Design a protein around this ligand. Structure first.
Ligand SMILES: *[C@@H]1O[C@H](CO[C@@H]2O[C@@H](C)[C@@H](O)[C@@H](O)[C@@H]2O)[C@@H](O[C@@H]2O[C@H](CO)[C@@H](O[C@@H]3O[C@H](CO)[C@@H](O)[C@H](O)[C@@H]3O)[C@H](O)[C@H]2NC(C)=O)[C@H](O)[C@H]1NC(C)=O
Ligand SMILES: *[C@@H]1O[C@H](CO)[C@@H](O[C@@H]2O[C@H](CO)[C@@H](O)[C@H](O)[C@H]2NC(C)=O)[C@H](O)[C@H]1NC(C)=O
Ligand SMILES: *[C@@H]1O[C@H](CO)[C@@H](O[C@@H]2O[C@H](CO)[C@@H](O)[C@H](O)[C@H]2NC(C)=O)[C@H](O)[C@H]1NC(C)=O
Ligand SMILES: *[C@@H]1O[C@H](CO)[C@@H](O[C@@H]2O[C@H](CO)[C@@H](O)[C@H](O)[C@H]2NC(C)=O)[C@H](O)[C@H]1NC(C)=O
Ligand SMILES: [Ca+2]
Ligand SMILES: [Ca+2]
Length: 546
């Protein structure tokens, strides 16, 4: 089924019958002291609470903005489920209300409302607007012309990619003719995006609040500089990892994939010579975690022996102040797929540490290759519960007919529920878009688990593949499993699901979004880097927010 098709704030508030300033602004110093105190109100639905907390994580992962639960502070933000989506711009000193209505529970919409509370206003309302966009007054609904009036000093250009900008179809009298068009033609496909903060959105936010760091980013490494991101090579090992440069025919670095000469560097450990169980260590610089859980993401390839082994280790403080204690975290091993692969590893370091990669030779004679590393990042966040790579996605998008589908591997959540994803690359329901939809899977735990599965938030994300989290605009969508999903869709998959021979399992009816992303949006940015599509999934209980 379709859950709910995505809608912009202008259409939501128009359907709710509001007449707010610039659509979502209530008018009745202006800069906040971090952390901003918040109250999640009783009337605010369970999905909305979880989505607001997920939006606060995005702020702590891209900015120095921070939020705390209320304790009797003077100024605060109270989040409620009144009519429409709206916010009061800037600190009001006595507290302010942010409204997240029905159909308003989306990362990009909540980020937009929080940016109003931080004191930002829409981009088409800047005095310089007329130089960058056309406003088609003859296409606006009568009485709504004031929503296009012009109304600071952060010294930045006009941002067509801004999370604050209105869509081409804002307040239209006709559904086919836009009220806004860009004076640079390419941007008619871009204006009014609902993915993430733009780069300029973050630069303005940083200039406004004196930010130069991020609460939940520890490290990243593309290996493009000569000092290799402060990583070092030990001597309690047999050999060394080489810093190769994409020059050799048929070898290309993940960061650039051969788009530039001389640039594009990866770490390599060769396995085609010497003796078995020879190894090499690559070790990070010392890191000081602020939270008790971290996620290490990286890209790798293994063209060598099936007996070769990439292993991730941590070295941590021995409790005297010396980072010398080892823990083995994770092991990776090869198969017939010689393309680049993505890996995620959970770390739980409460004290200072260094993350380590060990490459190991297996049978050197049955090896004609090596272990390859690029594009690391380390964030003070959970890892994605499931990850699905779809290969040759451009070829899939040309070959699949409307209503054909792909299905993921079966994943498992921390509670033990099985889940997966259904992808229709060519939608029948929205022509020119993907449909991504969630399904629950039968698994070995089904007998002890509660049914139907309810109060469990699903987050689906299409990864932007850019190595620095600040620069990423990953498309994201959220729902909470509910009793109201009937055709309850979330009952035990043996009773309400269809058996499939690929997973050897039952899979539920799919629920999610037609029009998750357009084909045009996937063909830009870094969503289809290497012609690989990467989808992330979480399936997490939010009943503790009740
Ligand atoms: C020698 O190594 C090959 C493959 O390893 C190769 O090493 C270098 C030459 C590389 O450049 C690559 O070409 C390659 O990594 C071994 O062949 C492999 O055997 C395994 C185990 O039988 C196969 O895995 C299985 O394959 C079957 C289907 O055939 C599946 O049903 C199983 O689920 C499982 O995946 C693997 O596919 C196969 N690979 C190839 C390319 O043939 C070979 O066994 C090994 N020989 C010795 C003496 O160790
Ligand atoms: C947040 O919104 C609520 C609801 O609109 C405001 O409470 C109202 O306050 C006015 C003025 O005191 C009263 O006339 C209404 O009867 C109140 N309504 C309700 C349901 O309480 C509240 O003042 C707003 N401000 C904040 C930040 O709490
Ligand atoms: C919205 O605009 C579209 C595009 O101009 C309108 O479609 C045209 O309508 C006129 C009058 O019926 C026809 O002569 C054209 O042949 C239509 N062109 C296309 C491309 O369909 C549409 O009717 C408009 N809708 C409203 C309510 O005004
Ligand atoms: C994606 O498409 C490419 C191109 O067809 C595939 O690469 C070919 O793989 C076959 C079988 O191994 C080789 O004989 C060709 O020489 C390869 N061509 C090129 C240009 O590399 C690739 O395997 C496909 N990937 C997947 C997994 O779908
Ligand atoms: Ca060494
Ligand atoms: Ca690189």
């Amino acid at each position: 089924a379709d859950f709910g098709e995505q809608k912009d704030i202008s259409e939501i508030n128009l359907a709710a019958g509001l007449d707010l300033f610039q659509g979502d602004i209530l008018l009745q110093n202006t800069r906040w002291t971090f952390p901003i105190p918040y109250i999640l109100a009783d009337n605010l639905g369970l999905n909305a609470k979880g989505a607001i907390l997920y939006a606060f994580e995005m702020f702590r992962l891209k900015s120095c903005v921070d939020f705390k639960p209320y304790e009797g502070e003077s100024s605060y933000i109270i989040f409620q489920q009144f009519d429409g989506c709206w916010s009061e711009v800037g600190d009001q000193h006595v507290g302010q209300n942010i409204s997240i209505g029905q159909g308003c529970a989306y990362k990009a919409i909540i980020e937009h409302e929080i940016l109003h509370a931080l004191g930002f206003y829409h981009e088409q309302s800047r005095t310089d607007r007329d130089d960058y966009v056309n406003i088609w007054w003859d296409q606006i609904l009568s009485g709504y012309q004031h929503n296009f009036d012009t109304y600071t000093d952060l010294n930045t250009p006009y941002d067509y990619e801004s999370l604050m900008h209105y869509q081409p179809f804002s307040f239209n009298k006709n559904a086919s003719v836009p009220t806004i068009t860009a004076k640079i033609p390419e941007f008619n496909s871009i204006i009014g995006q609902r993915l993430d903060f733009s780069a300029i959105d973050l630069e303005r936010l940083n200039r406004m609040y004196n930010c130069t760091t991020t609460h939940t980013l520890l490290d990243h490494c593309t290996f493009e500089k000569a000092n290799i991101c402060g990583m070092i090579q030990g001597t309690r090992d047999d050999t060394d990892w080489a810093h190769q440069d994409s020059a050799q025919a048929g070898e290309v670095d993940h960061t650039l994939l051969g788009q530039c000469t001389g640039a594009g560097y990866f770490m390599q450990f060769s396995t085609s010579s010497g003796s078995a169980e020879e190894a090499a260590l690559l070790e990070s610089r010392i890191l000081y975690p602020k939270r008790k859980q971290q996620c290490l993401q990286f890209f790798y390839k293994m063209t060598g022996s099936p007996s070769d082994r990439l292993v991730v280790w941590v070295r941590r403080d021995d409790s005297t102040g010396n980072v010398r204690k080892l823990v083995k975290v994770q092991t990776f091993q090869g198969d017939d797929d010689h393309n680049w692969k993505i890996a995620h590893v959970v770390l739980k370091e409460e004290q200072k540490f260094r993350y380590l990669f060990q490459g190991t030779k297996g049978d050197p004679q049955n090896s004609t290759g090596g272990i390859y590393l690029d594009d690391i990042t380390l964030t003070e966040t959970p890892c994605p519960t499931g990850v699905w790579t779809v290969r040759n996605f451009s070829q899939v998008l040309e070959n699949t007919s409307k209503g054909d589908k792909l299905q993921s591997p079966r994943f498992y959540n921390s509670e033990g529920y099985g889940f997966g994803v259904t992808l229709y690359p060519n939608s029948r329901e929205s022509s020119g878009y993907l449909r991504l939809a969630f399904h629950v899977c039968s698994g070995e735990n089904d007998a002890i688990l509660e049914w139907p599965v309810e109060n469990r938030q699903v987050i689906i994300t299409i990864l932007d593949q850019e190595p620095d989290v600040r620069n990423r605009m990953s498309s994201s969508m959220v729902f909470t499993t509910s009793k109201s999903h009937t055709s309850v869709i979330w009952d035990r998959p043996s009773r309400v699901g269809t058996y499939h021979t690929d997973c050897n399992c039952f899979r539920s009816i799919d629920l999610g979004w037609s029009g998750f992303i357009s084909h045009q949006m996937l063909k830009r940015r870094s969503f289809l880097k290497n012609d690989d599509l990467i989808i992330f999934v979480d399936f997490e209980d939010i009943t503790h927010l009740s």
